[PDB]
Amino acid sequence: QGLSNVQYIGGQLSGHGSPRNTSLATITQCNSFIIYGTDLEDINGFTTDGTAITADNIDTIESNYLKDISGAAIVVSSCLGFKIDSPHIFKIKTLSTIKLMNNTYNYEIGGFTPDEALKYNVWDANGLATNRISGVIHPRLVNSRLGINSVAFDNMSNKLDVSSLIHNETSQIIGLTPSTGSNVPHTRIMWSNGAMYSSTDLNNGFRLNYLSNHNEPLTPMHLYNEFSVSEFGGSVTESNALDEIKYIFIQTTYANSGDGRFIIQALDASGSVLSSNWYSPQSFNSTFPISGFVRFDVPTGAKKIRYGFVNSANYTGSLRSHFMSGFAYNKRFFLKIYAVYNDLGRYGQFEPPYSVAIDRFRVGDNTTQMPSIPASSATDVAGVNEVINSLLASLKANGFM
Amino acid sequence: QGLSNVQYIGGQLSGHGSPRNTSLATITQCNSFIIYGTDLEDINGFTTDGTAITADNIDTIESNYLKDISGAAIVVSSCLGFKIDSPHIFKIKTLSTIKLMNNTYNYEIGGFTPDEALKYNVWDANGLATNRISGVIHPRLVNSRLGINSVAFDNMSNKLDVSSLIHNETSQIIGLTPSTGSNVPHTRIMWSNGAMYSSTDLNNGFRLNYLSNHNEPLTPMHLYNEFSVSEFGGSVTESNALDEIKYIFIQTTYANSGDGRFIIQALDASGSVLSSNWYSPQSFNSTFPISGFVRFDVPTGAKKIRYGFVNSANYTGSLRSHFMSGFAYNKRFFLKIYAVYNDLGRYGQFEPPYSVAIDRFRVGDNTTQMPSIPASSATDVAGVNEVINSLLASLKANGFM
């Protein structure tokens, strides 16, 4: 506690003999603590109170002891310039390997042995609105059997080394007629199913239909999308082909309450639901009070994924007033979904099409909206011809040709 | 061999006196081997058999001794957590500087002195279908006179720090009429020349036309694209302007056989071919059995690049049955081409156009396909006008206005 420019080179920290430890090393209020290849092993984990950390109660621990200085092989609190390279770590019977908290904001984490703790590899618990965290995490810790929590992925500046966006959407600048604002999407361009809530005020957003639970079948009335994953041929064995997507991180805007829900489902080849989850507006709070992330675990053997927005109470709701709370926290809606690939680009990452040699993709399409031509009633056999000539002239001038 | 948490700090490893060495250091079956600034120099390379590694036979070595524990200044085999920072290295007369093999899967490589070996800087020889490798390589080793092999670029998680995509294409979800499936592109939109194989089953893919060798001229019958590089003006000397692109990396899907070829050509100002190559379906096997990468070396003084698909045997082929082998390995075709820039963003990287302030690029075009209006034969001088009014109404409603 209270040190600066500390180097721990080589050496070892181990709990041989099963003593009761909150952590192997606890670091608080230091500036630049650096660990070079130290050997870490054999912890028998407890919380600061004295509660044992086992598998059976692991989830309980993560809810009730988030702010505790405990729960990891190395606990880091209020440390500037933390850094650990890639040592061998094993036999970790606590919740995580590294825990970060209390405005530890420029850390850097090398690739140590993955999947040794009980729940995560890196557990980030930084939680104050005025902090600006930005860390660097080795990519092989993220696509592993345990991975990192949603807040660590929020704060990981190099997140595009393991993932790509499979959905990116934001609201327009200029509202469409008719509307009273431009805080949400005004069309259903990004979605295969569902509808807009109301055609007289498009600024109410999407329509949210009732669904009793997150594992129920979705219908064409609901707002949702579907895509298929891990499509290998008949001459490939599944033991060799592997799984295409390991985790999915969803980011969207925060609100203090609401009955609307973001829902995600992983389904097998014959339509059956393998796993599923939904999330409420106040779950999206890793970067309170604006936005946040949540994590979905894709089970092995999934063939399709469905994602969307629904209503958890029995009536037809609106994105504006049942997910965004009347824009009390955010004035611009956005939705980004990141796919973490099981193996970097084995199946080819998803991203927008492009070609440096094709002008349609290199610069875009130069067509413009045509000026409004009034419907014509001229019946002397040439007013119709003049209108046709006007329409053809507009088509030629506006790019459609 | 068989160690864990090994640190080699400072020091030196050198072959002064020309002893016969397979490597300077050999590491096998270790966990966390870390090298901090060690001085490596002067190796006289041999293989494990006893074959001298010279320039004259270098290519032969890379084919026949890929699985040998030899051929580099540092050879790493089955090591977790390998790490080397940036020491000075010189006089490396063997194939590569670092060689990685046998499921070394979370490595990290700093920027040591580039271009000291005979063929590569980093040589990745990991080759098992069930491994998931993900490494971090300093960017300055990739755009150097030797660079890294295709497999290392495959496994390099930070590959978007040195390159950008100049072609990215994948197959649609819903097939177009008429087709028997949706495993390949159904349109020729991304391509300037060539045609689809058949108009009665679009799921046969592109048409592949005959080409006798990869250095022959391409015609408008062949499926190919062209773009120009390194466009400096009259007041710039070429010794100052330099070269825009250096190593071009292509991945696409694997298949066990086929006569189709992916072809690439670098051409000088007056249309002449400076260099060229083509690749078979089974060349794309760095991530067997799904996809893989190959590398093309752009010669200095190139002014244009052409890339595309052709047939190496004298008859007209199809992408489905002569490059993808009837979808025996992949159900989803894709093609990504990565340009490694000679000097970062000096000439401006290529990527799709965008503007946060323009709604056409911020959210997309809201136009929708019009409902089918049947051809009309009404000749009393007003049925034609009713049809025109219907067409104008559809145009106004569908966004064209």
Residue numbers in the entry:
A (entry chain C), B (entry chain A): 505 to 905
What did the published study say regarding this structure?
In the present study, Klebsiella phage GH-K3-derived depolymerase Depo32 (encoded by gene gp32) was identified to exhibit high efficiency in specifically degrading the CPSs of K2 serotype K. pneumoniae. Phage depolymerases specifically recognize the glycosidic bonds on the host surface and randomly degrade them to release the repeating units (oligosaccharides) of the glycopolymers; thus, the phage particles can move closer to the cell surface and bind to host receptors. Here, GH-K3 gp32 was identified to encode a depolymerase, Depo32, which efficiently degrades the CPSs of K. pneumoniae K7 (K2 capsular type). In summary, Depo32 effectively binds and cleaves the CPSs of K2 capsular type K. pneumoniae via the putative active center constituted by Glu545/Glu423 and Asp546/Glu423 and initiates the hydrolysis process, causing the pathogens to become sensitive to elimination by the host immune system and thus achieving protective effects.
To understand the whole architecture as well as the potential modes of action of Depo32 on the K2-type CPS of K. pneumoniae, the structure of Depo32 was solved by cryo-electron microscopy (cryo-EM). Atomic models were built into the 2.46 Å nonsymmetrized and 2.32 Å C3-symmetrized maps and refined iteratively in real and reciprocal spaces. Both the nonsymmetrized and C3-symmetrized maps presented well-defined electron densities in the core region, and they all revealed trimeric architectures, similar to the overall characteristics of the previously identified tailspike proteins with known structures. In addition to the invisible N-terminal anchor domain and the helical-bundle domain (to residue 185) that may form the head of the spike protein, the remaining core region of the Depo32 monomer can be further split into the following domains: (i) a very short neck helix and the connection domain (residues 186–271), (ii) the β-helix domain (residues 272–642), (iii) the connection helix domain (residues 643–666), (iv) the carbohydrate-binding module (CBM) (residues 667–846), and (v) a C-terminal domain (residues 847–907). The three β-helix domains from the Depo32 trimer form a left-handed coiled β-coil architecture that is mainly mediated by polar interactions, whereas the residues inside the β-helical solenoid are highly hydrophobic. Through comprehensive inspection of the single β-helix domain or the trimer of Depo32, it was observed that both the intra- and intermolecular surface pockets were flanked by pairs of Asp/Glu residues, and the substrate oligosaccharides might associate at this location and be cleaved.
